[PDB]
Amino acid sequence: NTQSAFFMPSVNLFGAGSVNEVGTRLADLGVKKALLVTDAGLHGLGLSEKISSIIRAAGVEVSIFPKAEPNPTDKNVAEGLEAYNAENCDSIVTLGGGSSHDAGKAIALVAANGGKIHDYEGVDVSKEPMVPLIAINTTAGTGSELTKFTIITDTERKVKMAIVDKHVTPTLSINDPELMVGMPPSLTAATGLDALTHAIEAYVSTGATPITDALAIQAIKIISKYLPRAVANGKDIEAREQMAFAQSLAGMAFNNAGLGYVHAIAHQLGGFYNFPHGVCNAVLLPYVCRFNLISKVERYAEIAAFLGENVDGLSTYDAAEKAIKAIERMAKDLNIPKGFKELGAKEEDIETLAKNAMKDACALTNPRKPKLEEVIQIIKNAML
Amino acid sequence: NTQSAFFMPSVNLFGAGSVNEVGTRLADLGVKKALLVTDAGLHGLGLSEKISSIIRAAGVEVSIFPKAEPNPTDKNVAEGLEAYNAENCDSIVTLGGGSSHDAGKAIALVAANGGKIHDYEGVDVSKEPMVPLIAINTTAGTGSELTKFTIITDTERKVKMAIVDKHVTPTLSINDPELMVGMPPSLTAATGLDALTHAIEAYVSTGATPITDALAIQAIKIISKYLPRAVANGKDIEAREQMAFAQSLAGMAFNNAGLGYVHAIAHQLGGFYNFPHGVCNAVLLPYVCRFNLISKVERYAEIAAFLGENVDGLSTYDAAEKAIKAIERMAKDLNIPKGFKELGAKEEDIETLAKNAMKDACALTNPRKPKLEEVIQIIKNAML
Amino acid sequence: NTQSAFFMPSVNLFGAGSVNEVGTRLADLGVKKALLVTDAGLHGLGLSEKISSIIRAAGVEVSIFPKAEPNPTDKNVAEGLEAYNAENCDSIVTLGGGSSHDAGKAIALVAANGGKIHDYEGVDVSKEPMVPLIAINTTAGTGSELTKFTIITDTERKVKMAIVDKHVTPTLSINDPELMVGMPPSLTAATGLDALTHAIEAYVSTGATPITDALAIQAIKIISKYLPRAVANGKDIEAREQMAFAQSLAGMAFNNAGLGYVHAIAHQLGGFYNFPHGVCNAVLLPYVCRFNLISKVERYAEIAAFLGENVDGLSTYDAAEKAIKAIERMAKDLNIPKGFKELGAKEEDIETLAKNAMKDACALTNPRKPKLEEVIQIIKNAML
Amino acid sequence: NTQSAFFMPSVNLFGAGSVNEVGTRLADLGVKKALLVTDAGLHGLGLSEKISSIIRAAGVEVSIFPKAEPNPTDKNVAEGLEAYNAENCDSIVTLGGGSSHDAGKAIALVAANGGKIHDYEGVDVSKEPMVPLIAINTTAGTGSELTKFTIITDTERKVKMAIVDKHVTPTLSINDPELMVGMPPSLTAATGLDALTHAIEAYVSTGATPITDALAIQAIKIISKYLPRAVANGKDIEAREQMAFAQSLAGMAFNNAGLGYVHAIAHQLGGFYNFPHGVCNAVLLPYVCRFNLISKVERYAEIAAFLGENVDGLSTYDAAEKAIKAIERMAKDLNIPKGFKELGAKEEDIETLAKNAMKDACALTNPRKPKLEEVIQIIKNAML
């Protein structure tokens, strides 16, 4: 059979200032009091208070829960669920990067299906649709405000538990590039290379569609041109807005086409060592592309053109090669770490990271199907 | 402002056999009785009955309403609404092309808001969302199963009214290429060329964004390869599936970018003479493009590349002209009327047609702003 | 000798909202009362009351003189001059197109040089800096807010006279594209093609310089991309902003390199028939460029490429030919009159018109030097 | 806001012999005793006397202050201010290079505004326009007869302070290539590469406009053809005239677009070690361009073609790198030192150099925003 499906929230706001609608949009759902899920950093910057003011003007109450953590944890879910129940909230607003979107998605699911966030690992292992949720995005790399994914760390197993589930698609998303201006360069760089990774893995996924293809291609072309600008000058407003679009394009593509062994492996490093997700993808992306080359050489040749390379006079193989050269050059230019050893990864952990990566759902749509020793080789190469 | 927004059903099913889900999807919404809106043609072929038994086996009842006409009228909508109440319905399933979809959306909207369908001509007039509706698409050209559009003919004024309303986005859409094999050639061509007009007008709209751009580009490239194949052999399954993707992409593109004076004028020629919608687009498209050229010359030149033209060693202006020639050649190859006069249009109407087009919501995003006299000359050219 | 000079106001303001500075700016110049020289149309639209309040909110007094007529006249100058004294003003603020700039420069010059504006036809014949004057520009074509020219129609010999004096350089110019949005399409086209004429005549003028060359090349390139956009949709702010820049590059270039026989002839048609200055240049431009060709063949070839033409594999001669085809095509697409006879030009005037063109200052820098029979033929070709 | 402004002296004279107008132009101002600010070498040449003879031959009194030193000091400005009051001058005439123009500008401004020159470091500090000033320019590189910059060394801090102030735009400029023929090759090279640094940083500046782009592009093209010629044979009169146009095109460009980190860092190496400003720029230029590359890669690719490189079949990035190789090549050919250590800079000073560089007003328009650590890496690269 050849069926496929496309999912995203039914209303999706973009552009400078769109965050000011969160109040009146929340009232429109007839919710009374929302739990505002965010993280400590943005709470300290005061972003949680600016948004909470907007929501309360519209007559909707806020309880602020700034305890979601980079690489959100099952404990954050349990703790925020308690604060959801304790403060009599009927909705969730998320405010931040993908960590706040996924914390809030877990809380909103479990507040309507009951057990623990581990009940629902895998694919549509759920029952009811999650409680009303508006996702306000502030990094330019995840797309989690658009996706049916929620990535939650299992703290006793050391593994980022991918939860794929139609019930966690947000009600409404908001993508306001004015809230992204204050990303430091290194956060700009890594979330941006997470978007690029989404776009490239979605383009080469076995679950790719002409719709997801259309989005992924646009995302790669934009990122290629505007991500190094946004990193060099976070106050370049044009680059911020373009990255906000690219982020959403890549999120819509991967949500519906699937990822690959870049995310499969990056999820394990993130669980063992709590690395930044986006840095893990940037480090890994060239090695997985290299391994995948022979299964998708024409698509990698086209990525090489998307990334601005000149492929005139070359074989398809040689043009695919230039896509990897260009990814490497972009990583070096954005000051991405050279490998995982210098960050703290452990030689003795490589086989368990490999084995766990082959269990990740993101591995299912990788165009090349590896054996365990090949996955190990990819992690070894990324140690450099 | 520079704000914008992207709208779409939350869930959109694709691929061979995806109609089998309509009963259980309907059931999950908790509705008890659906009014099945289709047209006499599909009803005669018995498609109407296969779908009803699928819905019934899931516990939802069905009342069939096979009285949506090509270019659905206000009278169709009023009759549908009294069927809807008489048969104690709480939901709507539309089955067929864009006449079924729009008829059903209009019934659904009036059921939720009172008044009459005429009251909602314009942009975001209604207070309440339409009642639950699932759209099953049997043509490869409208995208109405995805859009906040519904086109209802005011029969006193002979105007196909454009109702553009967030509140008429279907709950869920189904796009089954197996239901599309039966289109005879001239229907394949007319709806395909409606899709190409969606993609072209979206691409040159002043409401274009990089998201809508991505979708429109892919639609044009796919249509240019596969539409002539679908017209040539309706049982070419790969062309049917590609066109089902192309028409969805173009739907998403125009739904969020806007249309232009092709649709604003076609709606008057359709309101006056009941011509097929995609035949009106096909006749007008080269004239409105030629007229729009100076405002979007670089985008028309790119469009010539997407359609396969060779623009080597040409000015942008000369390249854009090859795009009009390519559109003209495609129309001629699929047997479109070269003009309207041979179809029965009357010179004395032209002033009224032109004045009605300037009130259509699609005029709002056309990239060149015309004086009434310029609209008049465009129609007069389209006569011959 | 090979000396040369570059003149312009010492401060020039650009960008949206820059008009809000005219008041504070004026007061910092230490003046009390400004005679606001505008024309009837912009006074009818309320503009000279937006400006007038701004100048008053900064504690400076305004006396609106809305009597400058298209193709300003020795009478407007005299009547504005006596308005100047009677009302006890010490400064001029021009607001409008070239007509309002030129009226205010004439009033301000003769307000510090006693006599009558006739007393300064020619070159630098004034003997005193003109009264302090701030020029607020609202069309995109004459760059008079930058220049040392004022063109006053001698209602006598019916010839637009030239007072080329360094004393008429405005004190400070303001160039706010928001004020330009109101221009209707045909005013946008004609001021735009006058800007393009400025840029081309400056580029082929025997008075050219590497500096004027740099400005003219940019103006030609910008106008070629954005003037058709500005005509097609006056609400395209980007195209409005680019045209404001092109306007000033062309002004700065021709003000310091000189013009040629396009303006030399067009000044005669404007004195005899009061035709719009911009339209005169538009019709004349391709015929003079044809005549000028053999004196400047490489530079017209370069203009062809600035205007978008592809010139690979062409002789310099053939490339220079495409500059003229492209200028004609652009005149056709902006609905410029095809010749002067349909405007009201009389066969019996061609001799006087040509003899008078030969006495125009602008004739002096034209690269080809015509005998009287040759000017007469140019005027015949532009009658069609 | 998109607001911008273009500043420039109202009258600017060019060409051989133009310096013969200085007296009549100083007379037209109505001033009586001008302080003639020059340096020791031009004084001993006889240029101070020749010019004073012209100023006196038409009724104005001259008093020669020949004490401006390369990299003018706060003490020079103090001493020259005491001379200004001693002889009780009402004006100033600067004669020579940037050292003389900035000495005079600083004197004129403190004369008009009060305290000491250190008060006005930064942007638009002062309250009053400086006293009348005519700049006669004798090097082909500063453009400071045109600009609102004056660069005065704080001798305690060893900081060449950038005073960027509308109020120091000279009343009139004279740019006479006959006074430039005597530049010895090393000085021709250094002033020429300073002007190249002005065009390049103006072109990549975040303050660039279409106007400044026009000027800067022309400068680059002319410098790359004629600067090598002027160095190879200073009696080449054509190269001398071209270089006089390019230095002014570059002055107009950076004056209004802004500079970057080449000048921010150069100002500290000149303040600490009193190196010639142009040699400092030439050393830093490749390092800062390569740092800036990712933020302005399209524009650095254009710069490569402007400098004559062939870029066919190259990515934008590889094209941009060719620009840097061409920049390094020109410096090598004109005998500029490879680094700052052979000149006498010391590693122990680098931390203080970088911190002060970040306080320089020229840093604000650099297209990439550095951390202190990145400014330190640039200075270290430049030591070798």
Ligand SMILES: NC(=O)c1ccc[n+]([C@@H]2O[C@H](COP(=O)([O-])OP(=O)(O)OC[C@H]3O[C@@H](n4cnc5c(N)ncnc54)[C@H](O)[C@@H]3O)[C@@H](O)[C@H]2O)c1
């Ligand atoms: N479910 C999905 O669709 C999906 C997809 C990709 C990644 N993820 C998950 O998302 C997480 C990564 O999220 P992320 O990379 O967006 O970052 P994040 O949410 O982990 O945030 C990291 C840091 O960035 C800061 N920050 C965020 N926005 C900021 C702004 N505008 N200005 C200043 N600081 C700001 C936060 O305060 C925080 O300290 C991982 O857990 C990853 O697994 C989910």
Ligand SMILES: NC(=O)c1ccc[n+]([C@@H]2O[C@H](COP(=O)([O-])OP(=O)(O)OC[C@H]3O[C@@H](n4cnc5c(N)ncnc54)[C@H](O)[C@@H]3O)[C@@H](O)[C@H]2O)c1
């Ligand atoms: N709301 C929107 O987004 C939107 C967009 C474009 C057009 N429209 C409207 O849609 C209408 C046109 O719809 P359409 O062109 O899809 O056709 P349609 O709904 O008017 O149907 C045309 C004919 O085709 C037949 N048909 C449909 N599917 C068939 C199949 N699979 N096999 C055989 N016969 C089949 C029908 O029985 C009918 O007789 C117009 O009224 C137009 O204005 C709406």
Ligand SMILES: NC(=O)c1ccc[n+]([C@@H]2O[C@H](COP(=O)([O-])OP(=O)(O)OC[C@H]3O[C@@H](n4cnc5c(N)ncnc54)[C@H](O)[C@@H]3O)[C@@H](O)[C@H]2O)c1
């Ligand atoms: N440097 C110079 O001195 C110089 C150069 C070229 C031409 N000119 C002279 O300038 C005049 C040409 O002026 P012009 O072509 O700019 O037009 P204009 O000043 O003659 O005005 C033309 C018409 O346009 C209207 N208008 C102007 N700005 C408008 C706006 N923003 N919105 C709506 N309507 C607007 C005016 O009300 C008027 O009715 C002629 O006299 C010509 O000879 C002078």
Ligand SMILES: NC(=O)c1ccc[n+]([C@@H]2O[C@H](COP(=O)([O-])OP(=O)(O)OC[C@H]3O[C@@H](n4cnc5c(N)ncnc54)[C@H](O)[C@@H]3O)[C@@H](O)[C@H]2O)c1
């Ligand atoms: N816009 C600005 O304000 C601006 C821009 C760039 C540089 N500057 C400053 O200008 C200064 C550098 O000025 P410069 O490089 O023009 O030189 P300079 O004024 O420092 O003169 C250097 C030496 O060249 C000699 N010289 C000058 N002209 C000569 C000629 N025609 N023939 C023979 N010898 C001649 C002088 O006598 C002097 O000894 C620096 O302090 C720099 O910071 C200012």
Ligand SMILES: [Mn+2]
């Ligand atoms: Mn990711």
Ligand SMILES: [Mn+2]
């Ligand atoms: Mn349509």
Ligand SMILES: [Mn+2]
């Ligand atoms: Mn003109």
Ligand SMILES: [Mn+2]
């Ligand atoms: Mn400098």
